[PDB]
Design a protein around this nucleic acid. Structure first.
Lengths: 97, 104, 101, 98
DNA sequence: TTTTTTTTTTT
DNA sequence: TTTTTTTTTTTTT
């Protein structure tokens, strides 16, 4: 019994990087900036499945986007950890502007 | 500008730590485990930080294995490890702009 | 391009009502109380699909529950002939339900 | 002990209406359209304090907006009529988009 | 088409 | 000047 939800509205940092799995499923990375206080926070968002395809085709540097997903910390050595907002079938993405 | 919102429901990993800093502020850190339950024929760990009033309420009531609702913001803190290399810790900051609700 | 999301943590006011349709799709109705002196807001939450059966199985009066859904306002003509409006929280495959406690 | 949270991103139906209470504080109301792919949903949003002024000043028919608030059902009144509104106050948030 | 639930505190 | 006069589309927990 848990909940793990993240909601972001911000600007795409650089043009998305789309990659494809051995099974051919797209996965797309962006960085995403939100501002508070004025302070900029950078988020690593990774899209999977159909939304990865929509991300890489429609987002550019500067895009304002809404993003809904869940937090997962990815373990990767050479021991380091990247916390990412994972956007898949249980989440959402909407291009604004 | 922008929106930076995190909503978690999970169990507190360990007894909370409350620390008061020279400015008189409570800051309490916990870890939080959120679990998703699969099916075919699991666990995520979050670092949460309370400041201010909710820091006081967190330190008082939360214990090992308390169920809690947490609403905060994402914050990633850069730091150089002892090996010289930069590393990154992403936390969930819960302050006056957030919200906490003990559950049960 | 739109977002329509509701998130509630609250207490069920009474036992669920799960209604099955000829198709075998279930619909489950509850009301749900959230409190901010103390001030209680009552929500009408309706579950569709699998989550209708899961809510029907697991929610009871007094249950503390998290729900994530979407807002839906239903228009209807009252016996007085006048337009009325019921705004509900719709929980279906795009939503979530987690029994708390 | 509860949570009562609403998050909408959609488009304003018409120009905001803003009024002033005795104490001088603004209150802005709008309707907001959210569309699901085809089928539109209309929400009644009410802003209080600071955000009411901001909403009053920069929102107009068709403005794309992010809104964060709480649900509140207000019984009014010649019998009773109940409206459920999205109340955006100090605890909420609003972001103009585009 | 209208009753309730629950109760460990300057977004 | 109204009781929601309508908005606006860069597409299966």
């Amino acid at each position: 019994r848990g909940v793990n939800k993240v909601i972001l509205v911000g600007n795409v940092g650089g043009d998305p990087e789309t990659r494809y799995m051995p099974n051919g499923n797209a996965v797309t990375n962006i960085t995403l900036a939100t501002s508070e206080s004025e302070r900029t926070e950078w988020h690593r968002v990774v899209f999977f499945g159909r939304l990865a395809e929509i991300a890489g085709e429609y987002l550019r540097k500067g895009s304002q986007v809404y993003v809904e997903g869940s937090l997962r910390t990815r373990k990767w050595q050479g021991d380091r950890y990247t916390t990412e907002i994972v956007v898949d079938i249980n989440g959402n993405m909407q291009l604004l502007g």
